Amino acid sequence: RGLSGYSMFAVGIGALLFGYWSMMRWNRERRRLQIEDFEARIALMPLLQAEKDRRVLQMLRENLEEEATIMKDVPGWKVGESVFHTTRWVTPMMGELYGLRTGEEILSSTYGFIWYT
Amino acid sequence: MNPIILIIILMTVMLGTIIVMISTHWLLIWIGFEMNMLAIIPIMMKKHNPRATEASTKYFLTQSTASMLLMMAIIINLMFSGQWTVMKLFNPMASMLMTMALAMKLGMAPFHFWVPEVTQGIPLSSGLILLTWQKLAPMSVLYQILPSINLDLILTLSILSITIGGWGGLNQTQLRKIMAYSSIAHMGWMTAVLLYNPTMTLLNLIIYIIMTSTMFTLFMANSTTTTLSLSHTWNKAPIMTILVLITLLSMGGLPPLSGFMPKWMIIQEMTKNDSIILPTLMAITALLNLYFYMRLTYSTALTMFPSTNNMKMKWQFPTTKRMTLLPTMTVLSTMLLPLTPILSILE
Amino acid sequence: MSLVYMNIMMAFTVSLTGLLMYRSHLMSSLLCLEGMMLSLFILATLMILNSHFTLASMMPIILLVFAACEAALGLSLLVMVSNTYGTDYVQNLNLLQC
Amino acid sequence: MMTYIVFILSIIFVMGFVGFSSKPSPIYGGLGLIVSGGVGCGIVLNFGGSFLGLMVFLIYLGGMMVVFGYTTAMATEQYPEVWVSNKVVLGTFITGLLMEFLMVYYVLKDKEVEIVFKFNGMGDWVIYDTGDSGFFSEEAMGIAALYSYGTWLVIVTGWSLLIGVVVIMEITRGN
Amino acid sequence: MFMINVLTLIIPILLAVAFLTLVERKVLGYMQFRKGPNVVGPYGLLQPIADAIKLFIKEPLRPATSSISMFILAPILALTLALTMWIPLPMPYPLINMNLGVLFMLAMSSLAVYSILWSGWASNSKYALIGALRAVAQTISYEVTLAIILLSVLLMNGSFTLSTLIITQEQVWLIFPAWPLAMMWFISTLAETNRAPFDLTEGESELVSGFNVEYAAGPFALFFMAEYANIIMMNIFTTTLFLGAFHNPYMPELYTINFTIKSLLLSITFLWIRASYPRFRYDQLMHLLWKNFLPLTLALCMWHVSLPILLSSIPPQT
Amino acid sequence: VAAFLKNVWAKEPVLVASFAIAGLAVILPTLSPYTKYSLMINRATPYNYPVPLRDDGNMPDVPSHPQDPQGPSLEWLKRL
Amino acid sequence: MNLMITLLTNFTLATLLVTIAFWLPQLNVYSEKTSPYECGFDPMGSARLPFSMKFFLVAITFLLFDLEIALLLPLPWASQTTNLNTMLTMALLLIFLLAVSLAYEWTQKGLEWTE
Amino acid sequence: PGIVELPSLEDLKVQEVKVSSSVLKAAAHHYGAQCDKPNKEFMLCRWEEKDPRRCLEEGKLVNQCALEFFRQIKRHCAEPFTEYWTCIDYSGLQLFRRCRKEQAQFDKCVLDKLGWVRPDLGELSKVTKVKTDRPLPENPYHSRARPEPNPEVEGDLKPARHGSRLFFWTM
Amino acid sequence: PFFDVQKKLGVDLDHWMTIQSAEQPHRIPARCHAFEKEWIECAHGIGSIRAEKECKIEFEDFRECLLRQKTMKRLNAIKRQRDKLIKEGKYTPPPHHSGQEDLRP
Ligand SMILES: CCCCCCCCCCCCCCCCCC(=O)OC[C@H](COP(=O)([O-])OC[C@H](O)COP(=O)([O-])OC[C@H](COC(=O)CCCCCCCCCCCCCCCCC)OC(=O)CCCCCCCCCCCCCCCCC)OC(=O)CCCCCCCCCCCCCCCCC
Ligand SMILES: CCCCCCCCCCCCCCCCCC(=O)OC[C@H](COP(=O)([O-])OCC[N+](C)(C)C)OC(=O)CCCCCCCCCCCCCCCCC
Ligand SMILES: CCCCCCCCCCCCCCCCCC(=O)OC[C@H](COP(=O)(O)OCCN)OC(=O)CCCCCCCCCCCCCCCCC
Ligand SMILES: CCCCCCCCCCCCCCCCCC(=O)OC[C@H](COP(=O)(O)OCCN)OC(=O)CCCCCCCCCCCCCCCCC
Ligand SMILES: CCCCCCCCCCCCCCCCCC(=O)OC[C@H](COP(=O)(O)OCCN)OC(=O)CCCCCCCCCCCCCCCCC
């Protein structure tokens, strides 16, 4: 009983060709959709970058205006002294921003993306 | 072994040494050492007897431990420098660990405890590969990190290697253990001049490889692995006794021979740097190497030990062996001292 | 430096002294070389993921490859010791002492 | 004490290393190395390397299954040492654990320590980047660059694995 | 409220294992011309409860020669790794949405071997020793193709994310471009999950009960409800790979019903295979996944690398 | 060559299918017109930000707005 | 966070199905029921004797081929590159080197078992 | 070293764009079309200064130009945009492909009432030229004087004086 | 023996993973790209002996970018003094270091 060999190989290769055609069309459509999502990301990035700059400068100024109040009795302390010889901007460390804040904000800001589900 | 597989495995040993020599990245140095070890293990187990398996196990454990210390030195360099360039090391801890790793890979004392064992366990051809070609990749890395090598460490390793390799060969009657303690003493000579003039390190490496390749080619051409079987060579091929005479007197550092060439130049570069005690102790300690070389010349060339009756059959058969470059290496290991200023090509 | 590098270097040294002090059993120390590879993996990978030097992120994979590419070598050299002798005890490998 | 999670996983990493480095038996050596390689893919997974931790987990699971098969076939004795059967196993196991928790105690009380290097005592959350990588995890991009940029590394690694197979079949012959 | 979301995962699949025992026995009965359990409940709907009460009130029988710590730790890790491979599975929304959920499935498949392996070693018995090292021979056989098949089918996905494997199969099933990979993956999951013809560790005709021959009831239950959890998870994983259903984002229950009935048909297919085929020998197992499936898997890996470049159909990674 | 091919298809057909699929995967991307579009799609996928240029005064090919006619276009991807 | 809660739950109610499996039934311990199983007769010798592995060369080569799926695994990400013919050449080079390895292990009878 | 110079808290106060991410992603293409010029002046200042403290004022222009983008949506097309960002906001990955009919209604209402063309596939990823009057930073890395290199080799290569001069070798 | 085949033949075998400032995939910067660029452009061509003392400042800034030892020591001092002032009760934390602050964006 059953079909011959050539008939089953023809049905299998035809199923291959149909799957390859359908995945060709759908992956080209998915690449176009990815480019659309990335251009939405690009168009949002200047506003997010400006808010991120004001965010980190807000946090560094809050860490600086509270460093002078803590560091008042300590002799020879220099408030806001850079640990770098250069005067170039350095991107802040995680401890430079969230070093004086609560552990909930620390965990949600430094392990939040990795631990998220 | 299937000769296609032998060709591929020997080209892979050579490829590991070349990948260490030509690469500017620390991971590729480590890959070259791993490839070198991995490919040279079946060269040691070419014969499949328990001594080759023991030698291969001891060699695998020593070289694997050395490669672990090498990669830890590489990762500490990555921490303290943020980069991977094969140059000086930016931490004395990584400098110490890499100097220990390369000293283990060279078999320099007090990490010398594998070189007579592994050299005795394996054949003379694989022992030649071990004592010559495997002394090229760690000497490359030592040539490349000498702005960061601790002076006290490399000089302690060097003089400890010279003393222990001198005393070790005096108690030996096996030719492979003699060549292994000779290796230890000569690597001490090469690394003692490493921070003063590494051109003399390369000179000593090249002259040593010539003399060691001459001695192993003479041992293979005579099929001798003990002192007392080398002592039958006068009754079979008396020119080979002359060749081992001139080569062993060359390896002892006697003028007017070329093995006096590295030693003298090493002294010539260590007295410039106001070190007088250290090359003097090195020269006096090389008399031990000369003493067991003279023991082998007494047993082989200068006297005639009694032979057997069956040697009369071996008079009727010539050598069909590939004594590859044996007259060339015999001439280069003995008569090269008038060409001593050729060492400037190694600059 | 950072606190985790203390314990990863500590694990390297623990596996180092475990390798470098044999307990007369060769498989128990071939595990220690594999542990040294694990500690080097995690140490290098913490350094590379920390500094965002992304192109060296392929480096620990390569490192890990040569890990088993010698570990398999050791096992291929473990079975020849354990075919000559009934056990893989390292004190049976003392023929080259003479 | 949840900000110290990478430190706590690293304590379990050192505990697994003292577990298999005391060398009880390669059954329990494989146990301890699986435990260390499974918390080590939790140390390094909290730095962003989710691909690069799952692989050191998976490769070492295959590795310890192979090592299990060999230590049941070759490295087997009648009474295997569990963790406490030998005095020299238990002594150095307790020694490694007491010295490890000793340098835990000296680094949480003082917030700095020095064994050969100097180490901080704050939680290692402090050193992370305060930015985002966009629509790519950067370690995946770097390991993806092994095919575009790492061509010589591909050639030497694939050649080393090929001759590793050839080398191993030349060793395990006997004649 | 995530703890409820965990308890609404593992408790309905400690029930689906229980009724899977009944479905296994009854489909095994009606394919062997007899009937299954129809005595305890209404046509057998209480026989799983009867077995689940019987196994946990029987004397546990810890042996005298057994390494007791590994003897107890091995069924705990069995049921632990049986439960924890359900968390990246999209139903259409997974419990824990992993960016690399496929490699989590693969790594926990590699870790779940040690439950069988340490259970066979710990119970110091000669039949449990043979059933332990047959798991080594089985795992060095399927794992060397379990990863390249799963690589080649994700070269049409673009990532290792299981949830993106629904978006991948929104037009056509991924069994149509990858049916050799599908009919090789299905056999690889038979060989993984210790189902017939690849039992080979609990191989009843050779080894009396195999690796768990010393495990009496109670700890025997956690190897018996772990393996069935592995077959339901594994057919859900095969359904997600090759038989991905329609997902409406406003009606998730349509996707849940669709992949549920597809995974039930694949579980019934496992029961069809267990009730009809002679069991391999565990070297002929190895000369199948190495001499037959591994070269063709390497060829299809070359093809599924080169084909999305050949047709400009490289799937997105986002 | 045909009799040996029939012989190996009769004896080891899995290996024949393996070498056939591998040979197609080797030779066929070099014989396809769509392999160019793979590279063109991959280099037109904007992961990074298109960092703008300071207008010196002489850049006729660089636009001043994304909806300007000059610049790289993706109409070939829209049609295909 | 949720991952460790899920793993803690799975481990917790996998070990709490064991502690109510040992402590709930009535124990009757005597030193013949806890003996090992050798089909009724007493076992001759210990099961801690070396059980010789016939598939040992395949087991060592599994260590090498499992590294290949640490090298071939970034191919869904390597296909996203902008140097793509080079990626395709290196990918086909890695699968071809794995295949040359498997062919060498075949023809030298490394896949067969001993005895 | 020196005191780090941070701006004060009053220097950072600006009327923020207090909308969610789906509201931003729904209006993203028209934001990249209409708010092109101060955004590109800001990102040019941001990659050239390499210092956010020298980029605040341009950044405020961004926060000036985004809000006027949304008020002009709020005055005219508040309800089709509200339905469109709600439908975007439902999805987990926030798919544009699940919301094409609300996108068509929003684009039609915007093109009728405000005359904005939505950017096509490929336009927002272009590298554009920006006409600014701020100076080019002459040292954005705050670097210093590079050390003087070693002098090169020059002159014709004469032979060695008396050969090698190695103890007695006259050549 | 640094037989520099890669510069003789002009091939790039491993110069690309050499430093962090090299060409990275998708233009991803390292966290110490500016520090390493300044150190390499300082120490280029002047040799190692002049580079160990004339480019010491850029290499100290770059090493302190890499390991952040001075930063973590300063944060140790700040956090320890803050904990001491909390323990003595001579200082209270502000509301924006406790949560109730209605954060920026
Ligand atoms: C129209 C166009 C064409 C016109 C063509 C016109 C010419 C036609 C002939 C061309 C061919 C060349 C012929 C020789 C030229 C002159 C070379 C010469 O005598 O230099 C004197 C040379 C320096 O003397 P000088 O008073 O300062 O200057 C006279 C010249 O103006 C020196 O002039 P220079 O300043 O230019 O010399 C440079 C430098 C000047 O020398 C120096 O800077 C002093 C340091 C030289 C090396 C010292 C090394 C000491 C430690 C090793 C000692 C080894 C053992 C000693 C020998 C044992 C026997 C093997 O020499 C070297 O660096 C080369 C090293 C010595 C090789 C000399 C040439 C030998 C060729 C034949 C080889 C036969 C075996 C020779 C012995 C083997 C050992 C060399 O004397 C020595 O070094 C003492 C040894 C004697 C030299 C070799 C004698 C050659 C004739 C041998 C015939 C009998 C052979 C018997 C069988 C073989 C022995 C068993
Ligand atoms: C995922 C959803 C389900 C998918 C389908 C699965 C459902 C069906 C399952 C049926 C029950 C199976 C129970 C277990 C059986 C185990 C035994 C078994 O299967 O052994 C495998 C058998 C083994 O056969 P064997 O063992 O007889 O092999 C003999 C080998 N020698 C000679 C060395 C002894 O077959 C295979 O290995 C084939 C695997 C699949 C092949 C797919 C080929 C696709 C087409 C290739 C190209 C062909 C054309 C040429 C090129 C053209 C190019 C244009
Ligand atoms: C600073 C870096 C410098 C780098 C310089 C590189 C130069 C070339 C490489 C030199 C390094 C050492 C070379 C020798 C390695 C050992 C080769 C070997 O063992 O070959 C095997 C073969 C065995 O001979 P057979 O009798 O057939 O064997 C029976 C069964 N085994 O044959 C033998 O064992 C016989 C010996 C063959 C090789 C000896 C000749 C080459 C080395 C001697 C110096 C030649 C002069 C030119 C180079 C100078 C620098 C070394
Ligand atoms: C004595 C014998 C042993 C007895 C005790 C046995 C205990 C149970 C053993 C089995 C469980 C082993 C777990 C191993 C680690 C698994 C890590 C994991 O699940 O990673 C998957 C996932 C990756 O997702 P990702 O791509 O990061 O996406 C998030 C980014 N947006 O990751 C995520 O989504 C990130 C979520 C947070 C991850 C935290 C770090 C991992 C925690 C490891 C816990 C300890 C593991 C111990 C292993 C022991 C092995 C025997
Ligand atoms: C060039 C394209 C890329 C090729 C390389 C990539 C391959 C990818 C697939 C992975 C393959 C890995 C394993 C390959 C092993 C081959 C060697 C082998 O197994 O030889 C033995 C076999 C006969 O088996 P036997 O000797 O009986 O073994 C004992 C068990 N019965 O011997 C045989 O079966 C005969 C083998 C030689 C003849 C095969 C002919 C196939 C022709 C297919 C059509 C043409 C395809 C284009 C390529 C040219 C082929 C000549």
3-state secondary structure of H2: coil
Distances (CA, A) of E289 to A116, D50, E191, F21: 38, 29, 9, 18
Q: Comparing C-alpha atoms, which of B197, B200, B341 is closest to residue H160?
A: B341
Secondary structure of chain E in the HEC alphabet?
Answer: CHHHHHHHHHCHHHHHHHHHHHHHHHHHHHHCCCCCCCCCCCCCCCHHHHHHHHCCCCCCCCCCCCCHHHHHHHHHHHHHHHHCCCCCCCCCCCCCCCCCHHHHHHHHHHHCHHHHHHHHHHCCCHHHHHHHHHHHHHHHHHHHHHHHHHHHHHCCCCCCCCCHHHHCCCCCCCCCCCHHHHHHHHHHHHHHCCCCCCCCCCCCCCCCCHHHCCCCCCCCHHHHHHHHHHHHHHHHHHHHHHCCCCCECCEHHHHHHHHHHHHHHHHHHHHHHHCCCCCCCCCCCHHHHCCCHHHHHHHHHHHHHHHHHHCCCCCCCC
Dihedral sign computed on CA atoms, order B1, B5, B11, B15: negative
Mutation choice for D interface testing from B46, B47, B48 by most D CBs within 10 A: B48
Secondary structure of chain B in the HEC alphabet?
Answer: CCHHHHHHHHHHHHHHHHHHHHCCEHHHHHHHHHHHHHHHHHHHCCCCCHHHHHHHHHHHHHHHHHHHHHHHHHHHHHHHHCCCECCCCCCHHHHHHHHHHHHHHHCCCCCCCCHHHHHHHCCHHHHHHHHHHHHCHHHHHHHHCCCCCCHHHHHHHHHHHHHHHHHHHHHCCEHHHHHHHHHHHHHHHHHHCCCCCHHHHHHHHHHHHHHHHHHHHHHHHHCCCEHHHHCCHHHCCHHHHHHHHHHHHHHCCCCCCCCHHHHHHHHHHHCCCCCCHHHHHHHHHHHHHHHHHHHHHHHHHHCCCCCCCCHHHHCCCCCCCCCCCHHHHHHHHHCCHHHHHHHHHHC
Atom of ligand 3 nearest to the CA of B346: 1
Q: Which two tokens stand for residue B231?
A: 């002592």
Q: What is the Cα–Cα distance from E102 to D58, expressed in whole angstroms?
A: 12
Query: Could you tell me the domains of chain C?
Result: 1-86 (1.10.287.3510)
Q: What is the Cα–Cα distance from D116 to D124, expressed in whole angstroms?
A: 19
Nearest chain G Cα distance for residue A76, angstroms: 42
Atom of ligand 5 nearest to the CA of G100: 12
- Residue ranges covered by each domain of chain E: 1-318
Pick from I37, I42, I104: CB nearest H146:
I42
Q: Which two tokens stand for residue I1?
A: 């023996």
- Rg over alpha carbons for chain H, rounded to the nearest Å, is 29
3-state secondary structure of I94: coil
Q: Do B118 and C47 touch (CB under 8 A)?
A: no
Task: Using the structure block, give the residue that is written with the tokens 């080759």.
Answer: B52
Q: What is the Cα–Cα distance from B58 to B326, expressed in whole angstroms?
A: 31
Q: Which two tokens stand for residue C69?
A: 């590419």
Q: What is the Cα–Cα distance from B24 to B19, expressed in whole angstroms?
A: 10
Residue E296 Cα to ligand 2 midpoint, Å, equals: 9
Residue type, B107: G
- Residues in chain I with CB shorter than 8 Å from the CB of B31 are none
Note the ligand closest to the C-alpha atom of I1.
3
Q: Do D61 and E67 touch (CB under 8 A)?
A: no
Residue B257 Cα to ligand 1 midpoint, Å, equals: 16
Task: Using the structure block, give the residue that is written with the tokens 């149909």.
Answer: A18
Residue A6 CB–ligand 4 contact under 6 Å: no
Does any CB of chain D come closer than 8 Å to the CB of residue C94? no
Q: Comparing C-alpha atoms, which of D18, H4, H82 is closest to residue A91?
A: H4
Distances (CA, A) of E71 to E119, E216, I34: 6, 12, 56
Residue H162 CB–ligand 1 contact under 6 Å: no
Residue B253 Cα to ligand 1 midpoint, Å, equals: 23
Q: What is the Cα–Cα distance from B76 to D116, expressed in whole angstroms?
A: 12
Does any CB of chain E come closer than 8 Å to the CB of residue H90? yes
Nearest chain D Cα distance for residue C96, angstroms: 19
- Residue ranges covered by each domain of chain D: 4-172
Residue type, E152: S
Residues A7/A12/A17/A20 CA torsion (nearest 10 deg): 180
Q: What is the Cα–Cα distance from E97 to E161, expressed in whole angstroms?
A: 8
Q: Which two tokens stand for residue D138?
A: 């950067």
Residue B246 Cα to ligand 1 midpoint, Å, equals: 22
The DSSP symbol for H169 reads B
Residue E295 CB–ligand 5 contact under 6 Å: yes
Q: Give, for D118, the enclosing helix (H) or strand (E).
A: strand D117-120
Does any CB of chain E come closer than 8 Å to the CB of residue F21? yes
Q: Which two tokens stand for residue B72?
A: 């830890």
User: Buried b / exposed e across E249-258, counting CB within 10 Å, b at 16+?
Assistant: eeeeeebeeb
Q: Residue D91: CA atoms inside 13 Å, Cβ hemisphere, count?
A: 3
3-state secondary structure of D113: strand
Residue I59 CB partners (closer than 8 Å, separation 6+)? I39, I43
Cβ atoms within 10 A of the Cβ of A3, count?
10
- Residues in chain G with CB shorter than 8 Å from the CB of A103 are none
What resolution (Å)? 2.9
Mutation choice for A interface testing from D5, D43, D126 by most A CBs within 10 A: D126
Q: What is the Cα–Cα distance from H24 to A51, expressed in whole angstroms?
A: 14
Pick from A37, A58, A62: CB nearest H96:
A37
- Residues in chain B with CB shorter than 8 Å from the CB of I6 are 22-24
Q: Which two tokens stand for residue B222?
A: 């005579």
Residue nearest (by alpha carbon) to ligand 4 atom 40: D42
3-state secondary structure of H144: coil
Residue F20 CB–ligand 5 contact under 6 Å: yes
Atom of ligand 2 nearest to the CA of E241: 1
User: Buried b / exposed e across B255-280, counting CB within 10 Å, b at 16+?
Assistant: eebbbbbbbbbbbbbbeeeebeebbe
Report the chain D residue with the minimal C-alpha distance to residue I11: D152
Q: Do E295 and F29 touch (CB under 8 A)?
A: no
CB pairs under 8 A between C and G: 24
Q: Are G43 and E125 in contact (CB under 8 A)?
A: yes
Percentages helix, strand, coil for chain C, rounded to the nearest 5?
80, 0, 20
Architecture of the domain made up of D4-172: Up-down Bundle (1.20)
Nearest chain D Cα distance for residue I78, angstroms: 12
Q: Comparing C-alpha atoms, which of B21, B26, B125, B111 is closest to residue B63?
A: B111
- Rg over alpha carbons for chain B, rounded to the nearest Å, is 20
- Residues in chain I with CB shorter than 8 Å from the CB of F45 are none
Residue B338 Cα to ligand 1 midpoint, Å, equals: 9
Pick from A38, A106, A113: CB nearest D3:
A106
